[PDB]
Every structure is written in structure tokens, then in C-alpha cells.
Design a protein around this ligand. Sequence first.
Ligand SMILES: *[C@@H]1O[C@H](CO)[C@@H](O[C@@H]2O[C@H](CO)[C@@H](O[C@@H]3O[C@H](CO)[C@@H](O[C@@H]4O[C@H](CO)[C@@H](O)[C@H](O)[C@@H]4O)[C@H](O)[C@@H]3O)[C@H](O)[C@H]2NC(C)=O)[C@H](O)[C@H]1NC(C)=O
Ligand SMILES: *[C@H]1O[C@H](CO)[C@@H](O[C@@H]2O[C@H](CO)[C@@H](O[C@@H]3O[C@H](CO)[C@@H](O[C@@H]4O[C@H](CO)[C@@H](O)[C@H](O)[C@@H]4O)[C@H](O)[C@@H]3O)[C@H](O)[C@H]2NC(C)=O)[C@H](O)[C@H]1NC(C)=O
Ligand SMILES: *[C@@H]1O[C@H](CO)[C@@H](O[C@@H]2O[C@H](CO)[C@@H](O[C@@H]3O[C@H](CO)[C@@H](O)[C@H](O)[C@@H]3O)[C@H](O)[C@H]2NC(C)=O)[C@H](O)[C@H]1NC(C)=O
Ligand SMILES: *[C@@H]1O[C@H](CO)[C@@H](O[C@@H]2O[C@H](CO)[C@@H](O)[C@H](O)[C@H]2NC(C)=O)[C@H](O)[C@H]1NC(C)=O
Ligand SMILES: *[C@H]1O[C@H](CO)[C@@H](O[C@@H]2O[C@H](CO)[C@@H](O)[C@H](O)[C@H]2NC(C)=O)[C@H](O)[C@H]1NC(C)=O
Ligand SMILES: *[C@H]1O[C@H](CO)[C@@H](O[C@@H]2O[C@H](CO)[C@@H](O)[C@H](O)[C@H]2NC(C)=O)[C@H](O)[C@H]1NC(C)=O
Ligand SMILES: *[C@@H]1O[C@H](CO[C@@H]2O[C@@H](C)[C@@H](O)[C@@H](O)[C@@H]2O)[C@@H](O)[C@H](O)[C@H]1NC(C)=O
Length: 585
Amino acid sequence: LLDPCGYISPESPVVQLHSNFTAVCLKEKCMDYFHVNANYIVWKTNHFTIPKEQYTIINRTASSVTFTDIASLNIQLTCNLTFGQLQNVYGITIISLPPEKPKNLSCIVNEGKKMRCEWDGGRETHLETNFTLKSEWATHKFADCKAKRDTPTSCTVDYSTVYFVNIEVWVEAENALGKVTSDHINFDPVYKVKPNPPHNLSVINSEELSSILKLTWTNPSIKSVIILKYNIQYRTKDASTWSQIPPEDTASTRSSFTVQDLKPFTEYVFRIRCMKEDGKGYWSDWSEEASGITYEDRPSKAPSFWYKIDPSHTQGYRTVQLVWKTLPPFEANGKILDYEVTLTRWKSHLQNYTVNATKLTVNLTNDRYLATLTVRNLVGKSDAAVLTIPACDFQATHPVMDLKAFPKDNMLWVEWTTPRESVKKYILEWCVLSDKAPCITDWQQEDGTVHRTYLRGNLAESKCYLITVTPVYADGPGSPESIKAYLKQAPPSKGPTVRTKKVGKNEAVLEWDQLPVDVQNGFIRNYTIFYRTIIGNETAVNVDSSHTEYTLSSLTSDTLYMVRMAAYTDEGGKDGPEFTFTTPK
Ligand SMILES: *[C@@H]1O[C@H](CO)[C@@H](O[C@@H]2O[C@H](CO)[C@@H](O[C@@H]3O[C@H](CO)[C@@H](O[C@@H]4O[C@H](CO)[C@@H](O)[C@H](O)[C@@H]4O)[C@H](O)[C@@H]3O)[C@H](O)[C@H]2NC(C)=O)[C@H](O)[C@H]1NC(C)=O
Ligand SMILES: *[C@H]1O[C@H](CO)[C@@H](O[C@@H]2O[C@H](CO)[C@@H](O[C@@H]3O[C@H](CO)[C@@H](O[C@@H]4O[C@H](CO)[C@@H](O)[C@H](O)[C@@H]4O)[C@H](O)[C@@H]3O)[C@H](O)[C@H]2NC(C)=O)[C@H](O)[C@H]1NC(C)=O
Ligand SMILES: *[C@@H]1O[C@H](CO)[C@@H](O[C@@H]2O[C@H](CO)[C@@H](O[C@@H]3O[C@H](CO)[C@@H](O)[C@H](O)[C@@H]3O)[C@H](O)[C@H]2NC(C)=O)[C@H](O)[C@H]1NC(C)=O
Ligand SMILES: *[C@@H]1O[C@H](CO)[C@@H](O[C@@H]2O[C@H](CO)[C@@H](O)[C@H](O)[C@H]2NC(C)=O)[C@H](O)[C@H]1NC(C)=O
Ligand SMILES: *[C@H]1O[C@H](CO)[C@@H](O[C@@H]2O[C@H](CO)[C@@H](O)[C@H](O)[C@H]2NC(C)=O)[C@H](O)[C@H]1NC(C)=O
Ligand SMILES: *[C@H]1O[C@H](CO)[C@@H](O[C@@H]2O[C@H](CO)[C@@H](O)[C@H](O)[C@H]2NC(C)=O)[C@H](O)[C@H]1NC(C)=O
Ligand SMILES: *[C@@H]1O[C@H](CO[C@@H]2O[C@@H](C)[C@@H](O)[C@@H](O)[C@@H]2O)[C@@H](O)[C@H](O)[C@H]1NC(C)=O
């Protein structure tokens, strides 16, 4: 390496994005064998140039160029023509948003690690910059955190912290154009603890009381410097929704705690996070989660019971079909072990049974009877079911009454009036009308009381249900009542086939018959029968449904007449197959 003809000042600068650069520039002899002076030289720059009238030749050797103010990202001026013409002398590289009181600033003493402090830089400055974390005990005073380039805001001190002992922090921020500090803060670290989270967690419940399980576990290493205050969240294996638990109900350090009033025999799954008693300091992460079932606990309420009664078999004995429904794994309170019906008759004598299915189908006589189904499990023992299956002649008597049946909202409903004195359960069966589908039925039982219910199978529309409502009083079932109702209608599918009867010299009578159940897809309100001629204006009448004929009236003598008549279900109509008659002369 040798020499560089001429220098500026210096090789590098520093752009304080609003001020003036004092540049000055060709040594004593490089100016000799090239033959110029301060003159010959320009302050060029890869477009136009530091105008002539702009420079100020310092001495028989210089060329000061000052500056506007300043205006973009980099910036590279030139003290780069050899009098005769044709200087690449030296040039530089200035730079282009100073300091910035660091903002925000918090610290956390994350249990386990050392104190840790965050903040916020501000706005993209653009002159690399150095954050430093401070501190002092006024007893003494501490080393300095100095951010990591690859995370220029975080920071961890590097002394173990010392709860109870106000402490002193503030971020000192630096870059090229003037250093500053932040806004001081003063704490007692024991207020920025974030505890590990509780752990080694367990659920139990084999105390054998079916409303509760009870969790328990392990407080965090910090148990012993601060006073824990928790939140046991917990939910049902397969909810999406975490229930919490009253936080005055979990207030200070502890290692156990029983939650209660849970569904019996279910799966539950709990989890907790705790932090320092009052609330002054970050809470911690949730401990793994833990499971647990609940007691079992007797089956709570009746199974559903009824019998059906085939037209006796071997003249005397009368077979009798008992059948009952299954408790929803929730009236069950645990696996169903096996049903049990006992049977009692004529003053004094009776055998029981233990069916493990649901149709007990027994033998039986012509006395009055009375049956009793219960349902047992790994604990009990199931509240009594109860029928009266009678002496062979017990008739009707008292039926329900004022019974409607209808739909909405996409749910079929039957409601009637609460009969006479006091029925001890209704038990309404029902099924679907259609030629080409015997009658298969459904049934539900219904607590005595009630008088409106939404039947519950899987039924269909355009399809038409028959619904019977039998009430059960003391000593048997009552004269039952029955009603039809589709659940949602379509407009018939087919449509009536017309046809005349007779025909005057103007005015003839007409004839149909019924859109047959399975094609109606609904309660046929009414018939519109409309008719035109060849010149074919048309017109029409509508007809009060019940009607099967008519009497198209004042027509022409010697006319071509064409018809076609639609039938309509609330839902709407569908005209039949046009048919064409014609008066005499
Ligand atoms: C011959 O029979 C057919 C069979 O329906 C009649 O045509 C249908 O008639 C119903 C009612 O007459 C009607 O559709 C109604 O829509 C209403 C609402 O948009 C429903 O009203 C609701 O419930 C109450 C019933 O009025 C009402 O008070 C309440 O405010 C609410 O609006 C109403 O129940 C029906 O759903 C149409 O006019 C027609 N429906 C269809 C699908 O065609 C026809 O009216 C009969 N013709 C004669 C001349 O009697
Ligand atoms: C924070 O950030 C600023 C801005 O980037 C940093 O400025 C740096 O200052 C540090 C020391 O505070 C410095 O470490 C130097 O490395 C030099 C380059 O190699 C060293 O040179 C060494 O001795 C001679 C001097 O350059 C040289 O002959 C030899 O080659 C040898 O390497 C220098 O002496 C320091 O040891 C950085 O270089 C400098 N730049 C960078 C990118 O870090 C600084 O790190 C921080 N300053 C403060 C006040 O917090
Ligand atoms: C008649 O009564 C029995 C027992 O007295 C009842 O059996 C119960 O229902 C079935 C029996 O096979 C079981 O369902 C479950 O199957 C799954 C899947 O394989 C299995 O993982 C479950 O643990 C259980 O086996 C149920 O647990 C079973 N046992 C009992 C005590 O109820 C049922 O009402 C009738 N029996 C049968 C064989 O269906
Ligand atoms: C409490 O449980 C933690 C996590 O639930 C356990 O972590 C174990 O590390 C220990 C030593 O502490 C080993 O004996 C085990 O192999 C680890 N896991 C398990 C599931 O046993 C540990 O059992 C407990 N930790 C403390 C600090 O008491
Ligand atoms: C550059 O900036 C200051 C700011 O844009 C300007 O104000 C004065 O300018 C004249 C020469 O142009 C000088 O008399 C002064 O030196 C300037 N400041 C003062 C206090 O007089 C000026 O153009 C340049 N700057 C400075 C302060 O020297
Ligand atoms: C004449 O003027 C300039 C601007 O006053 C002088 O600036 C100096 O930079 C020089 C190198 O040229 C240093 O030796 C000095 O310390 C600065 N000031 C002075 C008074 O010397 C420079 O000396 C002169 N330039 C030339 C080419 O002779
Ligand atoms: C079925 O029938 C039993 C009647 O036989 C016996 O009755 C008395 C004397 C007790 O010894 C009884 O335990 C015997 O079984 C009922 O007692 C028995 O509990 C019945 N099963 C059920 C579920 O009731």
C-alpha cells in the first residue's frame, strides 16, 4: 500500500437527519505532476454535481462543500477534472433517527430463572442501537444487562434475586447520535414472581360419594416465600368448555381440594394455575391435566313400562308381551346390569324374574294382575316400575279428551286436557299411514301429570301419522283416543283424475274420488276445478274438499270443453290429468 492523492474528513461521517456537513478536500505533489490546484477539483456525485459557485476553496488547496439538510437512507459524496480536462480523488460515506426514551419496561422474576426485563424500542431509528438494563440496591449497585443483538429488547440480569428489597431499573438506549436513558422504576422483586405451575396432580373419588371427586397435588417450589392463590378449572371429558371455580373459594396456599356436585358416574378432567396470593404478579401455566370418573350411584327413576296383549293363544292362558325402554346412560348412573320384573296376582302369590333383555314375554291368566319392573346395577336397585294388567273384561272408562296433534318447530307435538281426576301416567303410542306398510308403532311413556309432549322417534313428512293417547289410572288403562297429523307437508304428488256424469245442453255434472293417502303427502284442504273451451278462455271454481262431484253450470249447447282439477294441502296443490267432455245439441 502507498498513497491516496487527497482525503476529506474523515473516511466516515454520521447523518443526524437534519443538519449541515462541513466537508473539505489533493496532497502537495499529486497536485504537482497533474498540474492543478484547489480548483481543478469537483465535488461530483453519480448524477449532476456540486455546482461550481457552491464550493469554497479554503486555501490555495481545499474546496469546502457544506450542505442543505439531509434526506435519505445511505449517502456517498465525492471529492472526485485535470485542468486540460478529465479526478477520482477520495469521496466518503455519510450515514442516515437518533435515540428514543425506551418505553413500557417490565420485569419478571420467572421462578427458577433470573430476573428478566422487557421493554419497547420505539420507531425504526436506522442507526444500529445499544440497549442496556440497569440496577441498584442503594445498599449497593449492580452489573449491567446489555441486550442480545438477536433479541435486542429482552434481557436477563445475572444476580440471583432477593425478595424484599426494593430494586431499581431503567433501560439505557444508545446509538450514534447521543445516548439517553428511560424512565426509572422501583420495585420489590417478590412482586414479579411467576411461579412454576402446580403439578403431579391426581383425581380421586373412591371415598364413595357420587356428587364429588377431589383433586390434590403439589405447590410450586416458591410455596415458601409467597402465598399461593389458585384457579382450578375443570370440565367434562368431552366438552370444549372449561368450567372454573369461584376464586374466593381458592385463595391461599394448599395442597388438596375437593370439587363437588358433579354428575355421577362420569369422566371429568381438571387442571389448575396458581400465582401469588393477592394478584400482584404473573400467573403461571396450567399443570398437565388430570382425569377421574365419579361414583356410580343407583339408577334414578323407573324404566319405561307397558305391555301389549296378543289375542290369547291356548284358550285360557293369555300370553302377555311386557316390554320397557332403556335408561339414558344418565338416569343409569353407570352400566345397566340387568332388569327385574316381579308379578303379583289374585289375593296372594307371585313369581319374579330378572330378564336381561327388555321383552319379558310371559304366560298369564284371566284374573286381575300387576307387574313390577325395576333396574339394577353395580350399586342398586332401581325405584319401582308399575303396571295393572287386568281381569278380562275391564273396559275403557275415562279417556283423555280434547286432544290436538301438530308440528313446530320441526318437532311433532301432541297436547290434550288433564282428564277428570288424576291420571298416573300417559303412555302414547303412534305409527304411519300408507298402503304398503302395515302398522308398525312407536310408544313413549309420559309422567302422569303432563298433558303436552313432543313425541320422539325419527319420523317423516309427506308421511301421515296416527297417534293414540292411552291414559293409565289406578287399575289399568283407559279407553284411549287417537288422531292423525303429518309433521311437515308437501303438495300432493299425483292429482285427482276427473270425469263427468251426465251432461245437459249446457251444464253437466262431474266426478272424481280421493287422492289416495300415500300420494297426498298431506291433509287435502280443497279442490280447484278449472275448465276451458277450444277458444279457450278458462275459469275455475274451488271446492270444499269433502265434495266428490259438482255440476259445471251454464255452459254452451254443442261445446268442446276441456278440464283438469287440482287438489291442495295447506302446503299447496297439484292439478290432476286434464280430461275432455262436451255438451249435446
Ligand atoms: C284452500 O285450502 C288451501 C290450503 O292451505 C289454502 O291455501 C293455503 O292457505 C294457507 C292458510 O289459508 C296460506 O298459507 C299460510 O301462510 C301464513 C303465513 O305466511 C300462515 O299464517 C300463520 O299462521 C296463522 C294462520 O293464518 C296466521 O294467523 C299467522 O299470522 C301466521 O301468518 C298460514 O297458517 C298458512 O301457512 C296460503 O293462503 C295457502 N298456503 C299455501 C302453501 O298454498 C287456501 O287458502 C284455501 N282457499 C280458500 C279460498 O279458502
Ligand atoms: C454495543 O453496540 C455498539 C454498536 O454496534 C458496539 O460498538 C462496538 O463496540 C464494541 C465494544 O464496546 C466493539 O468490540 C470491538 O471489536 C473491534 C473490532 O474487531 C475491536 O478491535 C480490536 O482491537 C482493535 C480495535 O478495533 C483492532 O485493531 C483489532 O482488530 C481488534 O479486533 C475493538 O477494539 C473492540 O474490541 C465492536 O467492534 C464495536 N462494533 C461492533 C459491531 O460491536 C459495541 O459492541 C456496544 N457498545 C456499547 C457501549 O455498549
Ligand atoms: C344383558 O346384561 C348384560 C350384563 O349383565 C349387559 O352387558 C353389557 O352391555 C355390553 C355387553 O357385552 C357391554 O358394552 C361394552 O362393550 C364395549 C366395547 O367392546 C366394552 O369396552 C365395554 O366395557 C362393555 O363391554 C357392557 O359393558 C356389558 N356388561 C355389563 C355388565 O353390562 C347387557 O345389557 C346384556 N348383555 C349383552 C351381552 O349384551
Ligand atoms: C413431580 O412430578 C414431576 C413431573 O410431574 C416429575 O418429573 C420427574 O423427574 C423425577 C425427578 O424429579 C423422575 O423421578 C421422573 O422420571 C420424572 N417424571 C415422572 C413422571 O416420574 C417428578 O416425579 C416430580 N418432581 C419433583 C421436583 O418433585
Ligand atoms: C446549517 O443549519 C443552521 C440550520 O439549518 C443554519 O443557520 C445558520 O446558517 C448560517 C449559514 O448559512 C450560519 O450563520 C450559522 O452557523 C447557522 N446557525 C447559526 C446559529 O447562525 C446554517 O445555515 C447552518 N448552521 C449552523 C448553526 O452553523
Ligand atoms: C488549509 O485549510 C484547511 C481548512 O482550514 C486546513 O484544514 C486542516 O486540515 C489539515 C490538513 O490539510 C490539518 O493539518 C489541520 O489541522 C487543519 N487545520 C489547519 C489550520 O491546518 C489545511 O491545513 C489546509 N489545506 C491545505 C491543502 O494546505
Ligand atoms: C324373588 O322372590 C323372593 C321370594 O323368595 C324368598 O322370600 C323371602 C322369604 C326371602 O328369603 C327372599 O330373599 C327369598 O328370595 C324375594 O324375596 C326375592 O327378593 C325376589 N327377588 C327380588 C328382586 O325381589
